[PDB]
Design an enzyme around this catalytic site. Structure first.
Site, PDB file in Angstrom:
ATOM      1  N   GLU A 146       0.842  -1.158   0.000  1.00 22.51           N
ATOM      2  CA  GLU A 146       0.000   0.000   0.000  1.00 22.51           C
ATOM      3  C   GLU A 146       0.898   1.234   0.000  1.00 22.51           C
ATOM      4  O   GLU A 146       1.913   1.238   0.677  1.00 22.51           O
ATOM      5  CB  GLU A 146      -0.865  -0.076   1.241  1.00 22.51           C
ATOM      6  CG  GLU A 146      -1.781   1.093   1.481  1.00 22.51           C
ATOM      7  CD  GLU A 146      -2.474   1.034   2.827  1.00 22.51           C
ATOM      8  OE1 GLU A 146      -2.918  -0.087   3.210  1.00 22.51           O
ATOM      9  OE2 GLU A 146      -2.581   2.115   3.486  1.00 22.51           O
ATOM     10  N   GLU A 151      -3.597  10.885   3.566  1.00 22.13           N
ATOM     11  CA  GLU A 151      -4.466  10.488   4.688  1.00 22.13           C
ATOM     12  C   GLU A 151      -4.490  11.688   5.640  1.00 22.13           C
ATOM     13  O   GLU A 151      -3.448  12.156   6.074  1.00 22.13           O
ATOM     14  CB  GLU A 151      -3.957   9.200   5.339  1.00 22.13           C
ATOM     15  CG  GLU A 151      -4.741   8.754   6.557  1.00 22.13           C
ATOM     16  CD  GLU A 151      -4.306   7.387   7.073  1.00 22.13           C
ATOM     17  OE1 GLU A 151      -3.086   7.179   7.286  1.00 22.13           O
ATOM     18  OE2 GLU A 151      -5.194   6.532   7.302  1.00 22.13           O
TER      19      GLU A 151
END
Ligand code: NA
Length: 299
Positions: A146, A151
């Site tokens: 990932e 974020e």
């Protein structure tokens, strides 16, 4: 190359060189989102995107992704958050605290094609003014690798109930993960640079910002915020120091994911959005104006 602008984004150059004798080539997965779509009339959305996660998972509790919480209008991908009166109860877990909460409906988008190094992926996005996570990220279909582009938590509410302080709306989390599935282990970088703050204290919620990553090879990521290189992640010691990839590094092709999440570890400490905060739908809407993708090719 000094050429006429073709897209919204051409006012901004690719912030890094493609390499000696190379140029950048726009990939067709890129989307300026200047069309209309919803769950019932996907039309142009359906040519590049699906309105769910890449597998049949409703998301980290108490998140419950919904197709109809995704749309495109007014030049942006829009992800909303709501909570009906009749919403189901879900069991939320982090550490081994355990808590029954009402679910939080939101949305998730996945690309129809995949990317692999070398590749530059950049979103122009306005982080939601919400305790919800606003996310742009990449994940391999086998769930072992990932890369996180954005974020972020945009709300001023940052205090648990307690015993924690949480990272606030002056931060973007720039990270990646490597996983072993069974028995489960998670590695990410853990140093202060991973939670990016600029020198002026920019509150990212307040406007659209470019955040991108140059996934250069399996041991090199470079993160770019508004065209400036702000974090370099280079070498085995920071990419995969525990050998979860067995030396391959970040090597597997990835789906691109755009979503919001009511993340478990935050929700269990009181940072799930209140019904009152969800009365304001603009505050709990993540907006992505565009997302662009370039690979290096021969000049
Ligand atoms: Na747009």
């Amino acid at each position: 190359s000094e050429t006429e602008f073709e897209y919204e984004w051409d006012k901004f150059p690719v912030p890094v060189s493609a390499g000696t004798g190379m140029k950048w080539e726009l990939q067709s997965q890129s989307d300026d989102f200047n069309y209309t779509a919803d769950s019932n009339n996907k039309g142009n959305f359906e040519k590049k995107w699906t309105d769910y996660y890449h597998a049949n998972w409703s998301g980290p509790a108490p998140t419950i992704w919904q197709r109809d919480h995704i749309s495109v209008s007014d030049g942006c991908l829009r992800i909303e958050t709501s909570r009906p009166d009749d919403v189901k109860i879900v069991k939320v877990t982090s550490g081994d605290k355990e808590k029954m909460m009402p679910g939080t409906y939101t949305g998730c988008v996945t690309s129809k094609t995949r990317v692999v190094y070398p590749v530059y992926v950049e979103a122009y996005a306005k982080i939601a003014n919400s305790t919800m996570a606003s996310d742009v990220w990449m994940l391999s279909p086998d769930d072992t690798q990932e890369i996180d582009i954005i974020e972020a938590y945009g709300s001023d509410r940052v205090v648990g109930d307690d015993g924690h302080k949480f990272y606030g709306p002056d931060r973007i989390h720039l990270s990646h993960h490597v996983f072993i599935r069974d028995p489960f282990q998670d590695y990410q970088p853990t140093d202060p640079g991973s939670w990016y703050k600029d020198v002026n204290g920019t509150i990212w919620r307040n406007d659209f910002h470019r955040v991108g990553v140059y996934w250069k090879d399996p041991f090199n990521l470079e993160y770019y915020v508004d065209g400036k290189m702000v974090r370099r992640v280079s070498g085995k010691n920071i990419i995969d120091p525990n050998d979860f990839t067995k030396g391959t590094g970040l090597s597997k092709e990835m789906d691109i994911i755009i979503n919001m999440e009511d993340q478990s570890w935050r929700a269990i400490s009181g940072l799930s959005p209140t019904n009152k905060e969800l009365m304001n739908k603009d505050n709990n809407t993540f907006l992505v104006d565009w997302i662009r993708i370039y690979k290096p090719v021969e000049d």
